[PDB]
């Protein structure tokens, strides 16, 4: 889409309908008159179009209404009501934009943000743009959270976010126009290479992959058609569905052979019956032939009784010679029909260990996208976020993804090396207790109105807790943390001094020897400008490889390469890096997934902020004081960076409305 309806899509919004959020802000309009709704939708899309048309600088309400066209530019109050709803929930004027109306002399309200993460940074700029006092507590000595950028010499690699999943309707596209970003497309071509180091053949590559997707649709059918989501009372994992789909195909291969060789024995036994008549008929022919020869011995002239006995036996012997030929016509058809069934046998087996190996590489590919083994992924809801996928190529940041958070964090209040130990949220305010990571005696006390908490789901999931919430987070919230999934994904980086790979291929596979190693270094990537290779460890493999030294990993890593490129070709790498995210105390994993028994609806529970109890008993229900943002909190875009970013714009809206007034809902 292009035009005004393009801007509505680039902003993740139906051009021809009001969203459920527009309804709570504009309920006099949504429930009003069908023409009314149309006028408003045009004002919305038209504004989005202006900001997206050149988002380097702020969109004043004056500039909007300037450019608004009659009859739309008549109701100035509606335009304000709309330019506010946008700027407020950060559908416009988010990011790094030169500000027209300079920041207010004196800010109102104090907000501590736990974590200089991408979600956290996103909130910081909006609240600071809104006119508030924002201060960020980060446990690391570097700004980005899971956006990590290793940099040495000219070597550059991201051990965190690496690819932008499509600019169609993506907030990150706007940042690139604002930020300096070398976005280069990834070419989807991916070869495969088995344990031998010999490339896979187009025959099998395609035979396997299509059967993979077909197996996916099979599970999807089980999930929504046969309501297969319980068994011995537990929830059904995606992996469990897969093996019941595979086990019903290995069942059908066997049923299909059995009712084929059971056809042969039906025709073997029609022949065994047939010969038995032929042999018995021959004996009757052999004896009538005798009798004929014996009564031909009586010489002419003979009386008529013996003349009949030669005529008779001759007609009887011609009668059984005529049967025996119609039973050698019939042995003709069956002896033929039985080379038929032997020359057209069915499929020998469902899958060759060569097939199931290349199939286990398509399951490593899933376990990469979800950063978990498929035993854990929920059968019905693992892909629940498929509908909001963006459009276009996937891209990479060749100058390092960390350039974004560093750009995002310019001019904010950030306290590095500040480990939050305890969040106290009370009816009158919040006090955040933080140690200095270097000297963990050294204590920090921070007081504020509301606390925005971009702690990664792992850190929350940690037992014993890295952070203690005073008071306890309530049971609906804690149970939403057990049910969800935080999974694990790791990267090995290999920095050589010259390219020894196909440079115009951005990525290639590696098929693993058993199932249990299916994610062990299953995929490589060539994206950085310098000669750098980068290799994934998905599935059960990635968690288990945290306990092995770099050298052992890199050794293994180096081997697979030699088998694909030859021992002479691969030199020892100059510098090497191994991530261990389940091991990092400021992650406790990689990103999140919809665990079996969880839903996309536990992602919504993570956003719902907490309003503390009355301090004085009998006092009026207070404000909600504790806010949550992060990739784990945003149902429609989880596990990503764009998604985490959006969530921190979400809470910048929700916070400002709660503490600076809903001035657009009149």
């Amino acid at each position: 889409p292009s035009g005004v309806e393009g801007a509505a899509f680039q902003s993740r919004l139906p051009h021809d309908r009001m969203t459920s959020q527009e309804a709570a802000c504009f309920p006099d309009i949504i429930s009003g008159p069908q023409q009314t709704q149309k006028v408003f939708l045009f004002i919305r899309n038209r504004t989005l179009q202006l900001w997206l048309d050149n988002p380097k600088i702020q969109l004043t309400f004056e500039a909007t209404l300037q450019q608004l066209e009659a009859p739309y530019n008549s109701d100035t109050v509606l335009v304000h009501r709309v330019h506010s709803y946008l700027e407020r929930h950060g559908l416009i004027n988010f990011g790094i934009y030169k500000r027209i109306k300079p920041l207010p002399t004196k800010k109102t309200g104090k907000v501590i943000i736990i974590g200089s993460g991408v979600s956290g940074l996103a909130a910081a700029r909006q609240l600071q743009s809104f006119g508030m006092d924002v201060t960020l507590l980060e446990a690391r000595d570097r700004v980005g959270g899971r956006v990590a950028t290793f940099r040495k010499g000219n070597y550059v690699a991201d051990l965190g976010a690496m690819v932008v999943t499509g600019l169609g309707g993506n907030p990150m596209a706007v940042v690139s126009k604002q930020v300096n970003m070398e976005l280069a497309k990834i070419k989807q071509k991916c070869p495969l290479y088995e344990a031998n180091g010999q490339a896979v053949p187009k025959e099998k590559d395609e035979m396997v992959e299509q059967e993979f997707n077909r197996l996916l649709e099979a599970t999807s059918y089980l999930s929504h058609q046969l309501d297969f989501n319980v068994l011995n009372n537990k929830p059904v994992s995606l992996g469990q569905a897969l093996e019941v789909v595979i086990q019903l195909q290995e069942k059908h291969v066997k049923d299909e052979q059995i009712e084929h060789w059971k056809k042969i024995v039906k025709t073997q036994e029609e022949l065994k019956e047939l010969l038995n008549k032929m042999v018995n008929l021959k004996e009757k022919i052999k004896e009538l032939h005798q009798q004929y020869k014996e009564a031909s011995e009586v010489k002419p002239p003979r009386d008529i009784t013996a003349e009949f006995l030669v005529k008779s036996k001759h007609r009887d012997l011609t009668a059984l010679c005529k049967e025996y030929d119609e039973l050698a016509e019939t042995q003709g058809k069956l002896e033929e029909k039985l080379q038929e069934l032997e020359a057209n046998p069915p499929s020998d087996v469902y899958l060759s260990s060569r097939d199931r190996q290349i199939l286990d590489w398509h399951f490593a590919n899933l376990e990469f996208a979800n950063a978990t083994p498929l035993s854990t992924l929920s059968l019905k809801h693992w892909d629940q976020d498929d509908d909001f996928e963006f459009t276009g190529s996937h891209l990479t940041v060749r100058n390092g993804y960390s350039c974004v958070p560093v750009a995002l964090a310019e001019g904010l209040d950030i306290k590095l090396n500040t480990a939050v130990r305890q969040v106290r949220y009370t009816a009158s305010g919040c006090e955040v207790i933080a140690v200095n990571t270097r000297s963990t005696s050294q204590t920090f006390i921070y007081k504020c109105d509301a606390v925005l908490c971009t702690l990664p789901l792992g850190v929350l999931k940690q037992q014993p807790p890295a952070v203690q919430f005073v008071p306890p987070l309530p049971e609906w919230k804690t149970s939403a943390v057990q049910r969800m999934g935080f999974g694990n994904l790791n990267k090995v980086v290999l920095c050589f001094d010259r390219v020894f790979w196909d440079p115009s291929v951005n990525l290639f596979g590696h098929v693993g020897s058993t199932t249990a190693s299916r994610g062990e270094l299953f995929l490589f990537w060539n994206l950085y400008k310098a000669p750098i290779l980068l290799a994934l460890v998905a599935g059960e493999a990635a968690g288990i490889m945290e306990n092995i030294s770099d050298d052992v990993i890199v050794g293994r890593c180096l081997a697979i390469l030699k088998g694909i490129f030859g021992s002479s070709a691969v030199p020892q790498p100059k510098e090497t890096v191994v991530s261990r995210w389940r091991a990092d105390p400021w992650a406790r994993g990689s990103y999140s997934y919809v665990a079996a028994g969880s839903s996309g609806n536990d992602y919504d529970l993570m956003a719902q902020p907490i309003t503390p109890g009355p301090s004085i008993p009998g006092a009026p229900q207070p404000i909600p004081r504790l806010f949550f943002a992060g990739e784990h909190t945003i149902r429609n875009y989880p596990a990503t960076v764009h998604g985490a970013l959006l969530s921190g714009l979400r809470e910048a809206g929700r916070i400002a409305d709660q503490f600076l007034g809903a001035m657009y809902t009149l």
């Binding site: 999943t165 990834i186 992959e209 993979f212 996916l216 693992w382 498929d386 995929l523 919809v594």
Partner: peptide
């Protein structure tokens, strides 16, 4: 999740 796959994106269970 499924959106993340950049190479050999899976098809089954999508809305194509």
């Amino acid at each position: 999740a499924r959106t993340m796959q950049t190479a050999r994106k899976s098809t089954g269970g999508k809305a194509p």
